């Protein structure tokens, strides 16, 4: 009965990723005064299926890699970890109810950088290795603010349990007391997921194929959705009625959908940061503010007498 539950998480995640490719293309299209996919199936509803099949029956052109084991390892790590990020998410009930669920997500997400590094080693080309190292530097840099911002929020929640964020926001969304952190959290997830205006892996190589390309893409888009589900829980907490858990699931899904659409909205609206500039956005802007807001959020519950319970 538990294996059924695992599959009923994995399969919808992969299907939602597939159709996010359609939604991204159509939302971007209409913001560009065009339509996007509307021929392959009604309203392009078969476009993700055609793309998936095409990619997998495509010739898997892998150049003689400097490491066969690390060539295979990188996509397995990327996709395996991406799905793991979903198992503690309360929707409203998590598949795995972890006491330290928030900490588990932070620890697993910090491992996702190995897929970038290993794929750089396996490419057998110093140019791609240098591109990998630049991406790793961007990713770890923005891990600093995500962790500190998350810690600041939990000082109002009282624990590392993800479902306790639901209780904390019973009366009010945490975005109201913590909109400054929500702002930097949101931008940090964009940079974390290498999304525009932080899509410098794509831009710099401009200035993988077939199934293995498809797998890295699936892991990326699974992470994008999961990040926005996390943001909704962290800052836009949905109320949970224990006798009607599906009302929570409907409302919480809408918020996550909208947050994910805002990722596409932002991609349509701005030019790209230079690499040194997104490094300065972190080290010289976000980090000073995050540190100061971290000091403030340690003091605030103590000085207001608003320390949350441990349990």
């Amino acid at each position: 009965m538990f294996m059924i539950n695992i599959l009923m998480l994995i399969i919808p995640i992969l299907l939602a990723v597939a159709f996010l490719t359609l939604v991204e293309r159509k939302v971007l299209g209409y913001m560009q005064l065009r339509k996007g996919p509307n021929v392959v199936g009604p309203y392009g509803l078969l476009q993700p299926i055609a793309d998936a099949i095409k990619l997998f029956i495509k010739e898997p052109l892998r150049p003689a890699t400097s490491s066969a084991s690390m060539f295979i390892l990188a996509p397995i790590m990327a996709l395996g970890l991406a799905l793991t990020m979903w198992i503690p998410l309360p929707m409203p009930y998590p598949l795995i109810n972890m006491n330290l669920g928030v900490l588990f997500m932070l620890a697993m997400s910090s491992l996702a950088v190995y897929s970038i590094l290993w794929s750089g080693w396996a490419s057998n080309s110093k140019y791609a290795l240098i591109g990998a190292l630049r991406a790793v530097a961007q990713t770890i840099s923005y891990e600093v603010t995500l962790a500190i911002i998350l810690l600041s929020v939990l000082l109002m929640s009282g624990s590392f349990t993800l479902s306790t964020l639901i209780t904390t926001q019973e009366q009010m969304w945490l975005i109201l007391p913590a909109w400054p952190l929500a702002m930097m959290w949101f931008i940090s997830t964009l940079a974390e997921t290498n999304r525009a205006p932080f899509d410098l892996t794509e831009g710099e190589s401009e200035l993988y194929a077939a199934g293995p390309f498809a797998l890295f893409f699936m892991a990326e888009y699974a992470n994008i959705i999961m990040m926005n589900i996390f943001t909704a829980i962290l800052f836009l907490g949905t109320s949970h009625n224990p006798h009607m858990p599906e009302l929570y699931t409907i409302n919480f899904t809408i918020k996550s959908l909208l947050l994910t659409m805002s990722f596409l909205w932002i991609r349509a609206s701005y030019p790209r940061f230079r690499y040194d500039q997104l490094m300065h956005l972190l080290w010289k802007n976000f980090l000073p503010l995050t540190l100061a807001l971290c000091m403030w959020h340690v003091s605030l519950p103590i000085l207001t007498s608003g320390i949350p319970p441990q349990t």
Binding site: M172, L174, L176, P177, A178, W179, L300, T304, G306
Partner: protein, 45 residues
């Protein structure tokens, strides 16, 4: 008969805009900061 070639209408065409038109919007810095701090205080309370 008469010469008929593409010509402007008698009296010319109507005026055509070309100058930049980026209208002013929103509140001042003071008001925006006030609303933001007001939200924080209500949130903290």
């Amino acid at each position: 008969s008469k010469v008929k070639q593409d010509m402007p209408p008698v009296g010319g065409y109507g005026p055509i805009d070309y100058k930049r038109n980026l209208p002013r919007r929103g509140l001042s810095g003071y008001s925006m900061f006030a609303v933001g701090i007001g939200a924080l205080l209500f949130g903290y309370w």
